[PDB]
Design a protein around this ligand. Structure first.
Ligand SMILES: Cc1cc2nc3c(=O)[nH]c(=O)nc-3n(C[C@H](O)[C@H](O)[C@H](O)COP(=O)(O)OP(=O)(O)OC[C@H]3O[C@@H](n4cnc5c(N)ncnc54)[C@H](O)[C@@H]3O)c2cc1C
Length: 500
């Protein structure tokens, strides 16, 4: 008896999962011949390559638990194998007598390299490998092909391309396993009956004092519930315009499906299909780029440009990316990273980010502009790294692509438009409720100076119980001065890049 193995990496879901569905149908179309091992590999190598904060670890933990629960309902389970894939797969290929391995493809350079090696090993041991592109709606390879070998570098060309492509068929959940015994314990399982059980919170989250509120639980089950909840107001969905949603409302002004889409707890293909059903129902509706479908297309856009550039997450060696002489300032980087810039709107966002692991798209704009072309002139790579650690939705292509946009390094070139760290939040939160919540030391400042506490006299600062320089920092830079200087620095960088 040989085993069929589905390997979760992303695609942490039962629904719309062709790679996992094929495994299951095969076992049921040929009962008694196959064992089924759905596995997730706790790969220590990924930590040399990316940062993971406490909040995102918990999200993964919760996700793996939900996925194990969901597989049990199909007379299966999740096997979480600890170790490096390069060492894990030769062992289990033999110990398990693996006939077929399936997994969902990923375009990230660490994923491509790792997957190539696994496919070289699988070819050697005579293991059949079947891969499916289901993490994105469109296959980036086919978009680039249709565009004659190059990724479209504007959203509108990208839309023009994918319009002519076939939308894939969205699958349901696999059928339960008919009369399948629990696989026999292997070398590892026999010396430890729990060697493959889902990790506890204690095993994954080493810095539990960095956990923030538990607001967006991981898991396919929570993903589907949040999607349904978000789709209930079809008028809100149909008339969604991303630029007009507030960055600093106390409740999220958008869907917060990003962590789920990032891990594949939600199929982007399913979400897209559900969105197109409402749009059909609702004749007055928004259109890309501002619409909710437009939002999913932004995800497709960045995956397509990223798939063509292994150096997408850095300035050097990146075909898309303007070469800009960013400066090194460790103290300013530290202040931004910990929301101690002295600009309450910026600090509010960076603190919501650290504590909760999600901030609105335009709040990411605000803090990203400030770090880079706007105020501090620090590389977008440094902001990417902080975002990587704290974001629940940390996504290799989307984090890099949007940082390049916000820094005017790629895709966006109107660097003379600079967010004000004082004015920008006021449009949608003139009372500063968002600042009061995340910078509570300023909570007694009136709306007239809560965005600009340095406009309050010392007497009033003492009266509000928050003296600048003691209880809340002084501004680390003066926006009105530096952002004018940085526009000149940007223009010089643009000139140098144009001449080369
Ligand atoms: C500096 C910076 C860094 C970012 N890093 C990430 C990241 O690491 N991971 C991430 O998922 N998004 C990232 N984004 C994009 C965007 O801000 C988030 O996708 C969005 O805030 C998610 O919130 P939401 O799910 O409520 O989005 P909604 O507006 O409800 O959109 C639905 C989905 O569309 C996609 N989407 C929406 N906006 C964008 C966008 N601008 N680019 C790409 N896809 C988009 C996401 O999958 C999102 O879940 C970043 C943006 C900026 C400016």
């Amino acid at each position: 008896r040989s085993t069929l193995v589905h390997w979760f990496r992303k695609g942490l879901r039962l629904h719309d999962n062709p790679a996992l569905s094929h495994i299951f149908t095969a076992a049921n179309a040929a009962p008694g011949r196959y064992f089924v091992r759905p596995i997730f590999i706790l790969d220590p190598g990924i930590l040399d390559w990316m940062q993971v904060g406490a909040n995102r670890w918990r999200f993964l933990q919760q996700t793996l638990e939900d996925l194990d629960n969901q597989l049990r309902k199909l007379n299966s389970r999740l096997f979480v194998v600890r170790g490096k894939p390069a060492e894990v797969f030769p062992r289990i290929f033999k110990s398990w007598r693996v006939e077929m391995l399936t997994f969902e493809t990923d375009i990230e350079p660490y994923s491509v390299t790792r997957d190539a090696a696994v496919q070289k090993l699988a070819k050697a041991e005579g293991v059949r490998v079947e891969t499916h592109c289901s993490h994105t709606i469109y296959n980036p390879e086919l978009v680039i092909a249709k565009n004659l070998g190059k990724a479209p570098i504007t959203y509108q060309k990208f839309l023009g391309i994918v319009e002519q492509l076939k939308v894939p068929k969205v699958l349901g959940v696999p059928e339960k396993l008919k009369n399948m015994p629990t696989p026999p314990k292997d070398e590892v399982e026999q010396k430890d009956s729990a060697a493959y059980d889902c990790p506890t919170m204690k095993q994954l989250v080493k810095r539990p004092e960095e956990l923030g509120p538990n607001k967006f639980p991981g898991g396919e089950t929570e993903a589907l519930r949040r999607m349904e909840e978000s789709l209930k107001d079809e008028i809100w969905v149909a008339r969604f315009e991303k630029p007009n949603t507030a960055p600093n409302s106390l409740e999220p002004s958008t869907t917060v499906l990003s962590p789920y889409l990032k891990f594949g707890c939600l199929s982007a293909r399913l979400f897209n299909q559900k969105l197109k059903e409402i749009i059909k129902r609702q004749p007055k509706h928004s259109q890309p780029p501002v619409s909710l479908i437009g939002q999913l297309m932004w995800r497709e856009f960045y995956y397509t440009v990223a798939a063509a550039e292994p150096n997408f997450d850095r300035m050097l060696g990146n075909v898309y990316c303007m070469q800009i002489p960013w400066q090194e300032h460790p103290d300013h980087l530290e202040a931004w990273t910990h929301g101690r810039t002295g600009y309450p709107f910026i600090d509010a966002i960076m603190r919501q980010l650290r504590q909760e692991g999600w901030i609105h798209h335009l709040a990411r704009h605000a803090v990203a502009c400030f770090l880079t072309r706007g105020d501090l002139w620090i590389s977008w790579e440094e902001g990417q790294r902080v975002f990587e650690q704290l974001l629940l939705d940390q996504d290799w292509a989307l984090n890099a692509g949007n940082w390049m946009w916000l820094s005017a390094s790629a895709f966006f070139h109107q660097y003379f438009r600079v967010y004000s760290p004082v004015a920008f939040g006021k449009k949608t939160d003139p009372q500063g409720h968002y600042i009061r919540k995340y910078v509570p030391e300023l909570s007694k400042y009136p709306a007239g100076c809560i965005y600009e506490p340095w406009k309050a006299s010392l007497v009033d600062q003492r009266a509000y119980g928050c003296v600048l320089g003691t209880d809340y920092p002084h501004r680390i830079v003066k926006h009105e001065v530096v952002h004018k200087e940085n526009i000149k620095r940007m223009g010089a960088a643009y000139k140098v890049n144009r001449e080369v």
